[PDB]
Ligand binder design. Structure first.
Ligand SMILES: Nc1ncnc2c1ncn2[C@@H]1O[C@H](COP(=O)(O)OP(=O)(O)OP(=O)(O)O)[C@@H](O)[C@H]1O
Ligand SMILES: Nc1ncnc2c1ncn2[C@@H]1O[C@H](COP(=O)(O)OP(=O)(O)OP(=O)(O)O)[C@@H](O)[C@H]1O
Ligand SMILES: Nc1ncnc2c1ncn2[C@@H]1O[C@H](COP(=O)(O)OP(=O)(O)OP(=O)(O)O)[C@@H](O)[C@H]1O
Ligand SMILES: Nc1ncnc2c1ncn2[C@@H]1O[C@H](COP(=O)(O)OP(=O)(O)OP(=O)(O)O)[C@@H](O)[C@H]1O
Lengths: 577, 486, 136, 124
């Protein structure tokens, strides 16, 4: 009991400058300015509530504040006080509160208060209610038993303010939100973490801050742990080589390399060697950053597609618009903000199938090098009534947290149906929630929404209104000359008679008028199939009736052109009305 | 006492990347105590393994603990729950205190999903304080470890979704031990049949090439079935000897297998020795057929027994399908070299009675691959939630058990034309099907074969290439084709 | 035209009247609750009556009462009937007046446009060149 | 105020009707009218016994105040058909409640509560 230790100092915590400044006039003052309040004659009966993302340092912040202040403090945890025998829980709570009042002034910290002060309706036991009321009555006992010179403030921290009982939450008047650290905060916390480490001067902390958008304090702690592991990885290799050379027979186990290394490590065990205190290079930090990505790995972000601009042909206008609207502002926000282009809410692609809107979106996601979320059709609808909109709200919360982010609403026709008729009624709460959440994400927030569809008439016209996805970029059938570039790119993505001078001849043929990009891909596949069919004839005649050649001949394209037809029939139905 | 185990690394293979990364992540903190003390840095980490069930997490952790040789405390999920309301809360604290006191050590929290479930989805108080106690104690080791002897927390679950994101943030290094690949499967087979008197003519590559989607436990069951196949002959010899010693003309007239069971009771205590023999490759080919993969989740219909001999004429469509699906499925390397992706599939269309369904069934039988049949619009469900989850789960199984042939019979009802706003339930299943066929997300190894009698009723977004767009006319056979078909 | 400056038009009337100005941002009052969906509407009018005189602003009026050619959605009927009753109850002397704002007159419930209730349809014009200079 | 508080309310109400006329007020009645269901049953029985046992010339009125009318029992809602609307507080009311917040506060002589209320239109 008695006073907190100095195991953690204020120097050990950073990135909370605004939070610490606000807390100064809230915990420090009614623990050292006790004479000021005594002359003032004003009781301070309020509870400071800490809330935010998990791992923002609330547990360490409380200990640092308690150590700095130095007043008597008793650490109270949610599971630390619950007892088996009936009444022992009330006994613990009342005795702790009485000790707090007797040893005044003092601070009281309630870690994970949500784990006790949850919801009384969801559980039927008569043992949680006594405690949820004992918190109230002991709090009132401090409210009464104060000499106005030694006032006591109770501090509570949790990662889910909502899960608290609103009756208790009412009287925690001041709620402090230690939100996601900004760019400068991450740089400062990185410096504080690498206060005691040997660092080469080539490290640029600005680059490290710029490369960690959606990160928390614990995230950077894990990053620096990975950096230390990478620093000692070199000595790991040296020890492995020495141990492997020590053992005879050159090769002992032919099972596998890492398994052999593991076995050799236990083969000696006690043969310890001096560990060099090597310096951590910036390259090691760059390597470690790309590995450890927590606080955003809860299935909220799909894998980034591996499709660069080399996988798409033509489409220069839509590429320019996407680069200047989405790709650009993420990379260099300052230049766009100076010219008056804030991070947009997003855009809305639309066109006949086979143009490649999905491919363009995937390429933009890949080149953005940011967190990407793909919503595969109506993956939000749920059988339970209270989950369908909760999914949308949680998705947008995740998108808001990990800015910048790209939201890809593929095939919005299933998510925003045209409700002019009574097409659906249970999904109205879905489209309304989607509109509300889209309006809740403003400019400079850092969230971009990209949607595509094949029928522009199915999407609700409320989406196209500005503020929401009103930037509609039309993608149509590529022109005759565009097909040349498309064929060139696709053939460059295949692997010899490449003969690029005949790609235009193939594409410009009157039989190849109305094909789309996927249709040119199908034509190329058919030509390859014809080549492979010819391969069978050559192999079964020259060799069986008397080699292997995957080289595509020119006549194969002409042969395949006859058997291929355009996919889309009437794009005029798709583009107007 | 908490001694290590005897499951040394030789029993685990095919996870070389995972094994090496876990080496660099776990071996150092449990052996860099001198290094960390020199650096003066409190180095501890939480590593969590997630992935498909049976990949070996529960055995990988045991093997690592045995290899390290430091104190290691097996802590299963349900062995921590006590009777009184608070006994389990103190039990978790006692486990963590035992870990921190006997440092350095490795902690294995098997099946952490059960006891560390989401608090919002489990509002009962007891597991709530259990999660809170784990959360509180897990930082105790970080704060109060004596620097030179740290501790690493290891846990393994088959499902990370129900895990608390709050507790998920604690575990930094998340390793996804995915389903093993061909090279991994061959190494796993070698590691399992490391200590068996296996015949010298065995070809592990032949086994691996014919193992589409098995898991480590699946290969273990393959080895177990092969072992029994090797001793079937000796069981038969023992049965013959037992029949010979007690002829009595015939001990029963009910049946032969039941008489075998009744005879085997007549000896029981009479011990006999079983000589062994080398396990043949043909025995492995039989065992793999007897054992059923982990993809047996009632989603793969039995392969139809209709070969090409059951279909007559139709030379053009047969050749085209041989080139389009049968070709790549049997010789994937040749098609990949030319640069052909796994084909999206074929949308058959024609008047009824032309045998398109029979052709599709024959293709499925010829492929000798996993096959899934969907009897019309059986996917649609009354609830809005499942109507799309059925399709997504079907495609997840198809991808996980690649390669696979998908046969959606009668496109007409499963996916109607969504050009006009006719209905709402179908208007969403069509959208999710379009998204799954060629949207974001690879699907290599999936072939979609559809048959219908109304080609101009499917959304034109589906007849496009990248989905089943290569439509093949199948109509009335000509006058001479009737001779062949008859 | 779309919601460019309808809030300005409503706020000018509120300022000249020197009364309270309460606005609802369209599809916000409607949430996953169905029992409290009408309760929110009732409470808004209750507070407006308490704070009389007041003006009430409903932009994006389509979000509440689209055309009920097909009266199928029971929640929609429960909302529209309650809203009609509350607005009809106090329209003469209580000092509360409700402002309806939308983009098209023809996507609103028909039982509102007839006289007595919100039958006064006014077309808001686009800003002029002098206005455009200030906008830029 | 699970049976003992009900007895306390019986003690209050029986003496209230016995000692008539008298004024009865139950503050934050919503928080104990959600044990609480027994409290609601006791309130119902008490209002009935006041209805039937009053001397008809000296009665007692059950007065209550709630921070939210919706929290009360619907049966209590129908029974409590008498309503008084405490709407937006007046400027004089706001000024006087501001002074009623600052009794023991050590304040200077420069405070002019009149203007604060006049520039405090939207607060409760
Ligand atoms: N601002 C910060 N300064 C220094 N270290 C920090 C900071 N934020 C986080 N950390 C580090 O991350 C971890 C935070 O753990 P801690 O338990 O204090 O977090 P928390 O926000 O209280 O979370 P929880 O609500 O889950 O208890 C510690 O290892 C701490 O050193
Ligand atoms: N312009 C193009 N350049 C390169 N490849 C293309 C192009 N157009 C189509 N393709 C190829 O064909 C495929 C068409 O699928 P995709 O989903 O991108 O088409 P879409 O026209 O955007 O329609 P939808 O997204 O509605 O299915 C692409 O994935 C790509 O492989
Ligand atoms: N990758 C593998 N290599 C070798 N053996 C394996 C592998 N995966 C599983 N096994 C075998 O499976 C058996 C034990 O599997 P186990 O149940 O521990 O797997 P798991 O992935 O940890 O399962 P779960 O996640 O359900 O706990 C042993 O016989 C072991 O040899
Ligand atoms: N070309 C054919 N070769 C062999 N048998 C055939 C052929 N065409 C039809 N049959 C026979 O006629 C029947 C055809 O049934 P099948 O299910 O294939 O019809 P379908 O034309 O595909 O129509 P549906 O759309 O109703 O499935 C079977 O009994 C089959 O044996």
């Amino acid at each position: 009991d008695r006073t907190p230790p100095t195991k953690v100092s204020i120097l050990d915590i950073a990135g909370v400058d605004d939070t610490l400044q606000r807390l100064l006039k809230e915990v420090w003052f009614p623990l050292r300015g006790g004479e000021a309040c005594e002359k003032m004659g004003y009781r301070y009966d309020n509870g400071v509530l800490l809330h935010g993302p998990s791992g923002c340092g609330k547990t360490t912040l409380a200990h640092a504040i308690a150590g700095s202040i130095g007043v008597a403090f008793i650490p109270v945890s949610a599971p630390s006080v619950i007892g088996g025998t009936s009444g022992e829980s009330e006994k613990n709570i009342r005795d702790v509160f009485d000790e707090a009042i007797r040893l005044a002034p003092c601070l009281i910290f309630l870690d994970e208060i949500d784990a006790i002060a949850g919801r009384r309706e969801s559980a039927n036991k008569g043992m949680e209610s006594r405690i949820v009321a004992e918190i109230m009555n002991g709090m009132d006992r401090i409210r009464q038993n104060t000499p106005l010179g030694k006032n006591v403030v109770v501090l509570a921290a949790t990662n889910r303010p909502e899960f608290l009982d609103p009756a208790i939450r009412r009287r925690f008047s001041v709620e402090i939100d230690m939100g996601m650290p900004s760019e400068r905060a991450r740089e400062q916390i990185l410096r504080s973490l690498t206060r005691d480490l040997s660092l080469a001067d080539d490290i640029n902390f600005k680059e490290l801050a710029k490369m960690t958008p959606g990160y928390v304090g614990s995230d950077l702690q894990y990053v620096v742990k990975a950096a230390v592991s990478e620093s000692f990885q070199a000595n790991i290799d040296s020890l492995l080589a020495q141990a492997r050379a020590k053992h005879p027979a050159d090769h002992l186990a032919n099972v596998s390399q890492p398994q052999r290394d593991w076995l050799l490590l236990e083969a000696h065990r006690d043969e310890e060697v001096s560990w060099p205190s090597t310096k951590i290079t910036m390259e090691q930090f760059r390597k470690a950053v790309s590995l450890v990505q927590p606080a955003s790995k809860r299935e909220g972000f799909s894998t980034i597609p591996d499709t660069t601009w080399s996988h798409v042909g033509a489409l220069e206008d839509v590429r320019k618009k996407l680069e200047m609207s989405i790709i650009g502002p993420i990379k260099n926000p300052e230049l766009f903000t100076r010219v008056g282009i804030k991070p947009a809410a997003g855009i809305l692609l639309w066109g006949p199938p086979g143009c490649g809107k999905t491919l363009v979106a995937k390429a933009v996601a890949n080149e953005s090098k940011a967190n990407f979320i793909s919503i595969k059709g109506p993956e939000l609808l749920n059988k339970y009534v209270g989950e369908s909109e909760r999914a949308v709200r949680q998705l947008f919360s995740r998108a808001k947290s990990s800015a910048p982010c790209i939201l890809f609403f593929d095939q919005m026709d299933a998510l925003v149906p045209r409700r002019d008729d009574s097409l659906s009624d249970a999904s109205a709460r879905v489209v309304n929630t989607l509109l509300t959440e889209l309006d809740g994400v403003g400019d400079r927030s850092g969230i971009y929404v990209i949607g595509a569809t094949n029928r522009p008439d199915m999407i609700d016209e409320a989406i196209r209104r500005p503020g929401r996805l009103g930037t509609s970029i039309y993608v149509g059938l590529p022109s005759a000359e565009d097909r040349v570039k498309i064929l060139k790119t696709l053939y460059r993505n295949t692997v010899q008679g490449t003969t690029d001078a005949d790609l235009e001849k193939v594409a410009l043929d009157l039989r190849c008028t109305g094909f789309s990009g996927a249709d040119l891909g199908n034509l190329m596949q058919a030509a390859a199939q014809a080549c492979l069919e010819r391969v069978y004839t050559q192999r079964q005649q020259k060799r069986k009736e008397g080699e292997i050649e995957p080289v595509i001949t020119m006549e194969d394209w002409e042969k395949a052109l006859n058997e291929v037809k355009p996919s889309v029939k009437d794009p005029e139905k798709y583009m107007h009305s």
